[PDB]
Design a protein around this ligand. Structure first.
Ligand SMILES: CCCCCCCCCCCCCCCCCC(=O)OC[C@H](COP(=O)([O-])OCC(O)COP(=O)([O-])OC[C@@H](COC(=O)CCCCCCCCCCCCCCCCC)OC(=O)CCCCCCCCCCCCCCCCC)OC(=O)CCCCCCCCCCCCCCCCC
Ligand SMILES: Cc1cc2nc3c(=O)[nH]c(=O)nc-3n(C[C@H](O)[C@H](O)[C@H](O)COP(=O)(O)O)c2cc1C
Ligand code: SF4
Lengths: 428, 56
């Protein structure tokens, strides 16, 4: 119960995350899927949610909220409408590649986990929204679904079970905002990817005005083997409040950038050193790291040596975990340029319906460009902090938060570099 | 300014006190009429930060 980050391959819940054995059915069936799914389904729905609540499985997307509670919001019967299950694969946040690398190389985990989630909840079918740029991955997935339909695992008798299910694959069109719970839903409905206000919640009224619970790829893909192996076993790894395995995408300024499944609450330094061998120039050459993709603030190397890769730890460090897409800077790169690029991205990917992210994100983009060039003065730094705090909790969706948090992470840990660039531009 | 130094004396005696120094008229001791441009200052509430109208 102390200093545990390393593990073995019996626990690797993504046994083919590198496409080394097989992605089709014949080859996936060997890796422990579609095994006892009839027994799982007919065991009961509440048994599945009990396994979830005992596993302590938090949402492995951006906003980590405990599942079981989330999936139990539509255990109630239907008052004259069908129910649906939207699997989210608009993996648009920077640094995040894990959902791609499972979409290809292990689609059947996803399919059976989605079925299991539906029968745990109630669902006529499912809608696997996938990014528009993921054409070949989506086609691998469609082939897997076709093999499943042919083998008799889905449809009029889903592995028997006295329960009928379908699995659809909706295809996006290239917008990061369509990863949100509600923009995704409206895009499936056939409109712009503009989020809704929440309330209403998708479990009372969602896609097509019907109940839904949106879920990420791995959030469901780990469901069936959790049911198959218990919440005790999944909760045994990781701290008591945020447990389980975790895919970890690593990018930038490290010798061997990679995707890894690892034990949650592993230290960031253990993670970087074991897999994706040491950063360029070694640890001393480290400058800052972003643990999430881009909707999480910076880390200054002062709390990289004494921090666990968890929700609670990074929250204690005035930061947060999202999809856990580690990104590294190594003293050889302008950092304000990087964060200005992130804000340029968050400007391009805004929907625009709510005023703060419509305007203030463009404010911050322009101001951070001006800080890159050094054409500002330090009385604007706290002004821009105030602009961030205006944008934070004044929005419909959490893209304003994601735009405002890297800003705060830079102002909190790298203000003197802004000061230096300003005085340099002023002198010259 | 031009009082020929004896009429100056007459008026300073009849009055009771020197008035060539404290004259009713203005010759060259006045602020001239075309001036440099200023730069007027700027009061508080121009703080650019930590300045919300609900507080002041
Ligand atoms: C009684 C004495 C006679 C008056 C006299 O000559 O005293 C002048 C003279 C004037 O002194 P002031 O007050 O200093 O003159 C002011 C500036 O000089 C003023 O400076 P300005 O820039 O104005 O230039 C003045 C200029 C102006 O040029 C003129 O003369 C003006 C045109 C003259 C007609 C008015 O010269 C004069 O004022 C000469 C005046 C001389 C008296 C003229 C008498 C004619 C009156 C008509 C009689 C008919 O007075 C004396 O020095 C003696 C005073 C004795 C009192 C005791
Ligand atoms: C702008 C924005 C973009 C998001 N994009 C994604 C995404 O691409 N993939 C994802 O899984 N979640 C994304 N989220 C978080 C979703 O709300 C979350 O994935 C979904 O609620 C499922 O949560 P879960 O991890 O409990 O399954 C995004 C949120 C915001 C505000
Ligand atoms: S924060 Fe941005 S993306 Fe989200 S609803 Fe408002 S304008 Fe749209």
């Amino acid at each position: 119960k102390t200093s545990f980050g390393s593990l073995k391959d019996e626990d690797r819940i993504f046994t083919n995350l590198y496409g080394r054995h097989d992605w089709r059915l014949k080859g996936a069936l060997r890796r422990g899927d579609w095994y006892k799914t009839k027994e799982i389904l007919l065991k009961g729905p509440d048994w599945i949610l009990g396994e979830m609540k005992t596993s302590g499985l938090r949402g492995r997307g951006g906003a980590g909220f405990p599942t079981g509670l989330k999936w139990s919001f539509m255990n109630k019967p239907s008052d004259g409408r069908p129910k649906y299950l939207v699997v989210n694969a608009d993996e648009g946040e920077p640094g995040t590649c894990k959902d791609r690398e499972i979409m290809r190389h292990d689609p059947h985990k996803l399919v059976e986990g989605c079925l299991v989630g539906g029968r745990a909840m109630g669902a006529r079918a499912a809608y696997i929204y996938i990014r528009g740029e993921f054409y070949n991955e989506a086609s691998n997935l469609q082939v897997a679904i076709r093999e499943a339909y042919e083998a008799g695992l889905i449809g009029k008798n889903a592995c028997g079970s006295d329960y009928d299910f379908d699995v659809f694959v909706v295809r996006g069109a290239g917008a990061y905002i369509c990863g949100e719970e509600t923009a995704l839903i409206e895009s499936i409905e056939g409109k712009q990817g503009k989020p809704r206000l929440k309330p209403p919640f998708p479990a009372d009224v969602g896609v097509f005005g019907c109940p839904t619970t949106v879920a990420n790829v791995e959030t469901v893909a780990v469901s069936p083997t959790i049911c198959r192996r218990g919440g005790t076993w999944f909760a045994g790894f990781g701290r008591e409040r945020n447990s389980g395995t975790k895919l970890f995408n690593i990018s930038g300024h490290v010798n061997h950038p990679c995707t890894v499944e690892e034990e949650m609450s592993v230290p960031l330094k253990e993670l970087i050193e074991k897999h994706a061998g040491g950063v360029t120039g070694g640890w001393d050459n480290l400058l800052a790291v972003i643990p999430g993709g881009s909707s999480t603030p910076l880390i200054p190397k002062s709390v990289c040596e004494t921090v666990l890769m968890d929700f609670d730890a990074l929250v204690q460090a005035q930061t947060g975990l999202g999809t856990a897409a580690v990104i590294v800077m190594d003293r050889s790169t302008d950092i304000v340029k990087a964060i200005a690029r992130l804000i340029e991205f968050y400007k391009h990917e805004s929907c625009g319906q709510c005023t703060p992210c419509r305007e203030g994100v463009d404010w911050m983009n322009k101001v951070m460009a001006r800080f890159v060039k050094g054409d500002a003065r330090p009385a604007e730094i706290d002004s821009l902090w105030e602009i961030s705090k205006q944008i934070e909790g004044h929005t419909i969706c959490a893209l304003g938060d994601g735009a405002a948090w890297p800003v705060q992470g830079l102002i909190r840990h790298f203000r003197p570099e802004l000061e230096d660039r300003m005085q340099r531009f002023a002198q010259q | 300014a031009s009082a020929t130094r004896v009429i100056q004396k007459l008026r300073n005696w009849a009055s009771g006190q020197d008035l060539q120094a404290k004259l009713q008229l203005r010759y060259q001791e006045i602020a001239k009429r075309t001036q440099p441009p200023p730069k007027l200052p700027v009061g508080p509430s121009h703080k650019l930060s930590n300045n919300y109208y609900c507080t002041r």
